[PDB]
Amino acid sequence: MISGILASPGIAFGKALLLKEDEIVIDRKKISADQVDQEVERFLSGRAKASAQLETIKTKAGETFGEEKEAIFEGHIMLLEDEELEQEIIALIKDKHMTADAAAHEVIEGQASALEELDDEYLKERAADVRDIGKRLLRNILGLKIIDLSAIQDEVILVAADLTPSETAQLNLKKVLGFITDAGGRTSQTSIMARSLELPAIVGTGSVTSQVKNDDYLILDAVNNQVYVNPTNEVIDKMRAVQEQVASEKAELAKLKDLPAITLDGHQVEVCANIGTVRDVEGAERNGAEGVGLYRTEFLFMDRDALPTEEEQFAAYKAVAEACGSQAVIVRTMDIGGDKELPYMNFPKEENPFLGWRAIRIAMDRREILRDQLRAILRASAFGKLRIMFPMIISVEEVRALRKEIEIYKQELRDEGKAFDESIEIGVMVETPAAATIARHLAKEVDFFSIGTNDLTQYTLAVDRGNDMISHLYQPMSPSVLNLIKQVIDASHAEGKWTGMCGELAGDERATLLLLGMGLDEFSMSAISIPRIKKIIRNTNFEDAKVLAEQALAQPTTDELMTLVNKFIEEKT
Amino acid sequence: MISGILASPGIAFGKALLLKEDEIVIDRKKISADQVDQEVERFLSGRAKASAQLETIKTKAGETFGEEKEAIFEGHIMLLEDEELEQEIIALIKDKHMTADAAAHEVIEGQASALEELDDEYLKERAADVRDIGKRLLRNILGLKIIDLSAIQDEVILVAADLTPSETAQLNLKKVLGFITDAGGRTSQTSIMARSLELPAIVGTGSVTSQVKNDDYLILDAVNNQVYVNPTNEVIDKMRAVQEQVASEKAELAKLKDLPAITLDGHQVEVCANIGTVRDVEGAERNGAEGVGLYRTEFLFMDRDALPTEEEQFAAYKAVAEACGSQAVIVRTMDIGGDKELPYMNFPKEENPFLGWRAIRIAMDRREILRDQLRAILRASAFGKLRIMFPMIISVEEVRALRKEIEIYKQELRDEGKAFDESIEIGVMVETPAAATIARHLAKEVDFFSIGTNDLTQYTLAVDRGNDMISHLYQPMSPSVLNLIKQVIDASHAEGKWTGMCGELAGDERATLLLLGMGLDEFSMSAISIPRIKKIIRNTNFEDAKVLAEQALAQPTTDELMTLVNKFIEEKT
């Protein structure tokens, strides 16, 4: 009668793998001065190994799982090589004459210990990944046998007292038919993977590993929450039928699913990822993005040491369009020239880059840039739903000149026997107070708007997004920016178009009810913000938010508008 | 029976002064190479004199007339020392082997000749002042006797074929009872002075100087347009009575006057000067300013090599308040930090000064600055009508924090037995799209607004006022900026306050009908623009302008809005 917390429902049959380790012994014996130089070298020599061995694990994650898991190792490796650790680890040994395994443990444990003080389950899990890096470092200095979970040649079930984030990367998902551990619970990194991977697994067994030996045959019910050890065929049978039900359940659920970001009372909005690079599509899918709301094409340009030609752009766009499957990508034409220069362009310096020769102002002074790019986007639209959107729009003049441009580039494509989506929709960033002001006029001329509040805030308040000295004045949650937001949304709706938002406000927990109440159609953010905002959306009543929004829009003061938001959150969920 | 054009009506009795000169002879004899080095030295040696002699005339103008006439000489002297003249004068002598008096004449004549090609009477007169500088230079190289009009010990009438701007400066106004010349007409610089000086004078005599000898006694009717030469007492009498009528005319007119900038149909606005320094009050009075609409106090701060203390500021403000007589000055608190740094502050660099730590953002981070200044303004208000206005306002928060500040500084003054105008009105620059957006809210909190369109344009369009590369996008005459202007004016009026404008649009001939139609209460500009705009205002019908304004505000395009303005100007005056 053994029961755990069951993190993923399902059924499985296979052999049991047991991870046996040698308790990490730490010597608290003080070292002499002559041993100070030797201990540092041992740390560097031991650190020298993990450096190369950690790199080997990274390459396996990229080929095995992809770039989504490959970069996590770079962060762990980059954090390990942090110059702060080198000076802090060496200082304690040199200053306190402590051992490298005891001194190094304090440094990584010290930071992770600070993270645990946090009162958040999400921050605590990351502290688990950081703790794992130091835990293996001690083995690396001592030189402990590395079982390595990658050396699995046969399908088996994975059983362990607890797994550290480092093992999950170099873990064979195809050869592991499930995961069973006695860790704490869902707050365990590996436990979250079972949920997302959708594979049967337990994490609160409590003491199954002490009852299982390697090569043991076990059947996981993950339905009755029971484990059969060397059971006859009468149980191997029941289970097999339990597994049938499980499979039928999928088959039935497989029909319809649910509705996207929808308030309690039925109001739907889109919620999408802003991206920079195909590589960001992974995070977007991971975080439940319903499409891409802003594809900052600059970022692709800073992903290279030369200006990407029509063809390179096309390919890059095609990949994205395809890595997005059915989903729509809003490809913004290039926005170089505020805090985002590309050095390879060698553009001249400006007194105020953010009020300078930025984005569209360049592509219009150098048509080859605008042309290659729009050409490339159009052509890529033959391969997935793309939209075109323009940055730094300031006038109706600009929009007409660029549409006219599109139309020219469209014909050329037609003439060169090159498909493009003839349906392709065109919109504009509203991220200038100009644009916001003439929103009505612009709304006749485009299919949609996305409000860039980073910029809009910047120009409306004349506060440089980069300038920490006045950051306290950078308030996208001003009665001034909100009003301009409303005015834009309304413009959209008056023409029967829609406004999205890719500025950081979309992703800001504190604006979500207002953005919603004000009728924003689409939110686009860092992928990581998608769930927080989705959550807020799913738990609001839309009508209430309207009332909230309206109130907020009448406040002459941020504080006063923050108050409304807060009393709402108090009274309303 | 001699008749001229009569530039100023009046009567006068006195001796006649005759300016006799020796025709300037120019040698067209080519010089040899050995003479090239000698001719340059002669030019430098001759130029060396005029350098010191011109400086002497400047000092007489400052003490005699004031700073208004002292700076005109600096421009003439600064232009003469222009490095372009040194290279061009020397190049022709060295390259064409020409004489210094013949080569130098071509350089000054060449530029003045280009100015005459202009089709404007105002630009042509300035070409007369530049021509005068080169005319005297030829005498300075030759070394011609200088009668000097400053050597007058007895009251006399001034008679000459024509006077060059240079003579008008070193001219004794108190010892000259009038001016008579046979020049071309009002297009003559000296002719304008008779109008502004309000003294009897003729400029189209045609040939009076050839009929008058120095020391001749002449009576100027300037009423019957006749001159009596050595006439009996019967005419010296009639005239004396004519002069009586003239004096009574003044006495009667001396009652009331007229109305300020008023459209044909009775709509009045204020029209004022923006200033930097007491010294600008002169230009303001000169150009018919009805008060000062913006006293950029920064400029006073850049008039010094140290931060001006409370006391220095007070004095500076007091002077202005007093140099303005009955007139109101709108003293703006200090606006340092976009393109206007004061080097002595050694502030650190910013990535976007114009979106940085500017104006009020400083005075609020360093109260001593705000305090000294507001203290000084208040105290100066005990001495003339002053208003306080704040730059770079972005929120209602900012305004309340600063009013609260005023109130504290007010009490301190009360407690130190220091008068200040308890009536003192407080307003804000609306030059941020934030301010423009929350204009309604701000209007409850201040007594007035002045729209800074230089900045407002800048932030609304995100185009740096400094950046020539994108200057073509800097359009204060956008449907976006105009709308925001309207919205501000309306805010004012809704609270029963008023909006003025000190941005350059106020002074822009092309906005005047719109600004007017949109109900702007007050215009403030460079003094030099006051008459052009006054003229436009005085010749419009206000109702028509409203209609114009309204139309313009609906245009989605600048061009389209320029068209309205133009068809107006065509059809309406």
Concise synopsis of the structure shown:
Two copies of one chain form a homodimer. Chain A has two domains: 1-220, no CATH class; 221-573, TIM Barrel (Alpha-Beta Barrel), CATH 3.20.20. In chain A, 48% of the residues lie in helices and 12% in strands.
What would the keywords be for this entry?
homodimer, 573 residues, alpha/beta, TIM Barrel, eight-stranded parallel β-barrel, six-stranded mixed sheet, globular, magnesium (chains A, B)
Commentary on this structure:
- Two copies of one chain form a homodimer.
- Chain A folds into two domains: 220 residues, no CATH class; 353 residues, Alpha-Beta Barrel (TIM Barrel).
- Helices cover 48% and strands 12% of the residues of chain A.
- In chain A, β2, α6 and β3 form a beta-alpha-beta unit.
- In chain A, α1 packs antiparallel against α2, α11 packs parallel to α13 and α21 runs antiparallel to α22.
- The longest helix of chain A is centred in the first third of the chain and has 32 residues.
- The interface between A and B is large, with 50 and 50 residues.
- Chains A, B: Homodimer. Interacts with the pole-localizer protein TmaR. Binding to TmaR is reversible as long as TmaR can get phosphorylated, whereas binding to non-phosphorylated TmaR is very strong and shifts the equilibrium toward binding.
- Chains A, B: It is found in: Cytoplasm.
- Chains A, B: Keywords: Cytoplasm, Kinase, Magnesium, Metal-binding, Phosphoprotein, Phosphotransferase system, Sugar transport, Transferase, Transport.
- Chains A, B: One of its GO terms (molecular function) is metal ion binding.
